[PDB]
């Protein structure tokens, strides 16, 4: 239902203002290939690591979430 993938404080993950309930909010690489941002306000960057959001409707917008976890 929702990603359960973890990632360390130097792997690379996504924000997308348009798509998160709070700034804390992220979704892994895999998750954001496979969904839908374009003209998004969306950075790839580093998080201090964390835990994908793809799935969740408390963290992420459903239109944000990829193909695998909608
Ligand atoms: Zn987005
Ligand atoms: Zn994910
Ligand atoms: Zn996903």
């Not at 998080?47 to 799935?55: A, F, P, V």
Request: proline letters at 3%; one cysteine or more.
């Amino acid at each position: 239902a929702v990603c359960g993938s973890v990632w360390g404080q130097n792997d690379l993950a996504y924000r997308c203002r348009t798509c998160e309930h709070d700034p804390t909010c992220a979704i892994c690489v895999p998750c954001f290939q496979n969904g839908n941002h374009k003209d998004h306000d969306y950075s790839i960057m580093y998080t201090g690591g964390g835990c994908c959001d793809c799935g969740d409707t408390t963290a992420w917008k459903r239109e944000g979430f990829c193909s695998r976890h909608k």
